[PDB]
Design a protein around this ligand. Structure first.
Ligand code: BR8
Ligand code: BR8
Ligand code: BR8
Ligand code: BR8
Ligand code: BR8
Ligand code: BR8
Ligand code: MG
Ligand code: MG
Ligand code: MG
Ligand code: MG
Ligand code: MG
Ligand code: MG
Lengths: 347, 351, 351, 347
């Protein structure tokens, strides 16, 4: 009889762990039961975003203090970029004593020449199986959202790779984020059976954006070399007030999937609603026939636009700004769209 | 009896006037009756945004071709900044002649604005006078029949500040991005003053962009490097106009308050669709919070605050109205409450 | 016997042609003899830079006024991006008639470039042919007498890529900022091919923006959203020209290699001063290092790499030549070694 | 007979302390003798720059490891913004057993309503006296460079201030950096006798840019609430190979002061040369008559331009890119200019 408990904690700063410390001090959260922490941090959400790594170090110090080496098994998904009115926050996932289930998993360092290729797809497919097992889930149809934290390439990482005779899938550092999210997304797809294995090859990745998962949510970062996996789903072997529902946004302003999730969860939009969504600029250069400018803008990187825009669209529906919106939906939902999940209690 | 005709035209480029050319060529739009053109252009919407001036020049060239010197009387409001999915377009406002109350349109211009008047009572009075003129031209005497007042106002660059100081004057600021806020703010109070939403002996230099408790529910101001004076366009309802188009408006309490638009669409007897026309002001709240939750728009040295506000509010409204060809403008100094802004809708009745 | 006249004109705005107007009005510049105009405009110098197109339109309007349809034969190279202290200006190249070897100028144009040719041998051959034509027009047959070849080339936007795919074609990229590099690169190889710095059977699609060991010491390419073809301007020395102006050039080994300019000024018998004219390419090095030390230009999602390179190299050169009215252009694909770029100086002899 | 030793350490990352660890491991640097560390970090060098605070935490952990609570007396000046080719690095100042002298000092937290006012000017003037004493310097004419790390204001910090009835000198967060650097600069000026005390008042600060120090170098940051002071100068009571010279750059491309410093130091430009310089966009909007665009640019903040530009100008002279250039020279050198210092050995 395990219990899922999800806690949304405000932050004033990437290094501001004061509020999580407080939930531990008041015994609202028990350090021993922390599975994973998601975050929105104030960085640019792209390559040179050190708010991500900054938060990670700060969370590491605090969690090790309370659980020493067992902190290292906690999944830290720090997703940068809080544009528009999107409010920075931590999402703490704690395990307690059918309802919401949580499973986690890790991977070894990822060879720079494996990134964006079938190497990454595999190595991630496995972790998703392990973590969805640890969640106590056997039916893929009972999975609702799979978060992945993946690596990326810098110019210096690229030249290091070439120095030992290897080639990387790109030398463009920002493209390398897309490849990593995409390859990871297909790995998630593979493990949930949304894609056939012989449908995949290096040439397919970030090319056939017709292959996609309705549940992949992948976030790239400069601060890790392997992967973090967190599976959220519904299970018979879990109990508690919290359930999760999900849907696919067809484009950047498609908010009906969220209204549908709330219905399924039997909850109404309010400050209490937890929202996880992927935002992506559509590669057509259009939304519902109308041209957009995100792919042609040299000042503000495309994912910064997408986040700002869908965060606004979603906040207009759910009524508050503490929502988790993540940019770049390579093979995560249809092109121009992305998965969205809601976590609420029944009324 | 005159008819308002409002035309939304796509553009691929700030200088793409091809769709306006075609509308004129097919007689969909008669150049003689063009009162004003609004635009969202692909620039950054701040100080060094030349997509605005580029569109103006392009529009001026086309219109001089058809109207000659009368082209100069057309109000050109080019508001830059199309962040998020917001889609670049022109809004052409035409007056035509036809046979209940309908959309009315009035325009007015002003002389150049002395750099030392910007952000001060000089600007306020100048715009106020112009707004009264445009009101009259719309055939509107009751301010409650005014629904939206668009103003294009100037700003300060380093060069302009030093020009002013060179002749013994001071400007209200030397921060060029701040000058855009002051200029929008002074213009907004001018609109307020003209509509009677604010009392004249309540206003002074010291109040402007200081007492954000003074605001208009109808002001919409957009600053730009490309003009030295103001363009004023008043939109309202009038008994002396007819046609299918009406206008409704409301005030967003904050950046995610989408209820004013749904209420506006009800008043108009219309439902959200590709055809809905939306004009809205988006503003980062100076409290640094939205509904208790902190935001980072005022603290970001990479992306200028209005750039955030626009992308964010455009997304909220687009989510409601179902398309991205909407006019959203950043910085709501004295335009609605702090953190909010006016929103207006223009639709035809279907119920 | 023809004379090169080079005029450096300040601008307050991309659309500020006032100084060029005055130079024409005072007969300092005769419109008939205007061969090309270079510009540094206040845009970001990347994909969505409309200061370039804005200056072009403005220049086209003024020149059509004086020359009519012959205006269209003037090469307009507007290079955006004036970071750091770099000062926005126009460089007007005029041919005049006078009575040793001196500055020679040649221009040439090309037809529109098929989107599926950009970054591929199509573009390379197109530019190569044009550079040969401009060479001839300059009255230059010896390539060693060519000192600098400026090329304005197109780029790809999302819309253009989807247009190409719609008719069964592929483009060499879908990354619009990458398309600028490919276009500069293909053009540079075209210049190289035309000057014999590279062999034709060394070139192929697979080489372009891949083998940065193939490069020209004289190529200078600038990409822009505002044209579909190319503008070519060849600068060199010729026996068949006379006048005070000569040109010298060199290759910066990296971003802080200022020795080529000092050597160039020696060759020209001139010393650094307000009058020195400088044209240079700046490029972030793909090794990610300068002289062993890492740089962050390739890793920055806020500021695009060429934006860095320009500001940085402009500072180095400005520190040498003593003023900030210099023409610095970013992205040196096949223009000099990786991390370097050509620099040319134009001066009159005083020793 | 104290010895000044200055060590320039490369970094791949704001949190990359591997190279400083190595100098400690090889005994090239002794943790006990570390006085202050200067840094160039990859952030935007402005308000939301977390690479600064990120480095600080990383340096804190490493230094506390070796010297515990005595690490806290080490001055950490992390200056963000590495535009152009400027290469991120640490400058470690260690004390060993007339030549280069080093003195340090601290200040308490700074009240948000004191920032940019005579409060800050004073509180900093004192620390500069204390630190220049600890350096063993009595003649102000023997001081060559005074580094200050100062605080700034965020929107949330502003509303916190107003909540208790106080007003701040600004509500513009980026302006608050200028006020803090300026007020600190005048404080340094005050202590070196470059300015008279009754010449100062709130109204003068960041207004009369005719009052300035030839030695102030002030750097603002979101990650501290008080001030860090480091004085560098020439002393009889110090010995060793290292000397320091300084000069004032009249504008952004005035490189002759550095050639002059090298002459005084009897060294020639080379990879070995250490450079400290302040860069500022001139408020005239011109450099030597020619208009510039730094004050009118809404995409890239003015100090980001200035750094890129003078870093390039200086690197062209000194031949390498590992130089410390800091943006914004309010009362630090003339308007449009800034102090520059060089540290070399005699040949
Ligand atoms: O939203 C996102 C997507 C990503 O890949 N990396 C981030 O830091 N944030
Ligand atoms: O409002 C203002 C006026 C000024 O001069 N400087 C500023 O920073 N803000
Ligand atoms: O949204 C806006 C507000 C403004 O003042 N100027 C613009 O160009 N766009
Ligand atoms: O060079 C290229 C071609 C492409 O399609 N996508 C990329 O990211 N880079
Ligand atoms: O510096 C440059 C290089 C380019 O390709 N295009 C520009 O507009 N400026
Ligand atoms: O160069 C600088 C000046 C400053 O105030 N703050 C920084 O982080 N860097
Ligand atoms: Mg998708
Ligand atoms: Mg349309
Ligand atoms: Mg408002
Ligand atoms: Mg001049
Ligand atoms: Mg090169
Ligand atoms: Mg100064």
């Amino acid at each position: 009889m395990p219990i899922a408990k999800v806690h949304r904690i405000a932050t004033a700063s990437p290094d501001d762990v004061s509020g999580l410390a407080a939930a531990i001090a008041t015994g609202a959260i028990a350090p021993a039961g922390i599975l994973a922490i998601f975050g929105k941090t104030e960085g640019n959400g792209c390559v040179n975003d050190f708010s991500r790594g900054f938060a990670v170090q700060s969370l590491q110090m605090l969690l090790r203090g309370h659980m020493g080496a067992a902190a290292d098994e906690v999944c830290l998904v720090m997703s940068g970029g809080t544009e528009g009115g999107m409010s920075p926050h931590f999402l703490v996932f704690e395990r307690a004593e059918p309802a919401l289930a949580i499973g986690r998993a890790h991977t070894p360092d990822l060879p720079f020449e494996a990134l964006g290729r079938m190497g990454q797809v595999r190595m991630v497919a496995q972790a998703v199986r392990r973590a969805m097992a640890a969640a106590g889930i056997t039916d893929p149809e009972d999975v609702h959202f799979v978060q992945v934290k993946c690596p990326l390439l810098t110019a210096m990482r690229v030249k290091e790779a070439e120095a030992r005779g290897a080639t990387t899938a790109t030398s463009d550092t920002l493209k390398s984020m897309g490849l990593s999210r995409g390859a990871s997304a297909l790995g998630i797809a593979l493990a949930l059976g949304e894609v056939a294995e012989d449908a995949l090859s290096d040439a397919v990745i970030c090319a056939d954006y017709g292959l996609w998962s309705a549940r992949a949510s992948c976030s790239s970062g400069i601060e890790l070399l392997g992967h973090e996996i967190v599976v959220l789903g519904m299970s018979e072997g879990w109990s508690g007030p919290l359930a999760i529902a999900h849907g696919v946004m067809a484009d950047a302003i498609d908010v009906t999937p969220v209204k549908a999730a709330l219905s399924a969860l039997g909850a109404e939009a309010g400050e209490a609603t937890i929202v996880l969504a992927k935002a992506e600029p559509s590669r057509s250069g259009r939304i519902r026939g109308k041209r957009h400018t995100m792919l042609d803008d040299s000042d503000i990187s495309p994912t910064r636009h997408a986040r700002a825009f869908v965060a606004g669209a979603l906040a207009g529906v759910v009524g508050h700004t503490e929502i988790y919106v993540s940019g770049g939906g390579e093979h995560q939902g249809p092109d121009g769209g992305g998965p969205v999940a809601v976590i609420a209690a029944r009324t």
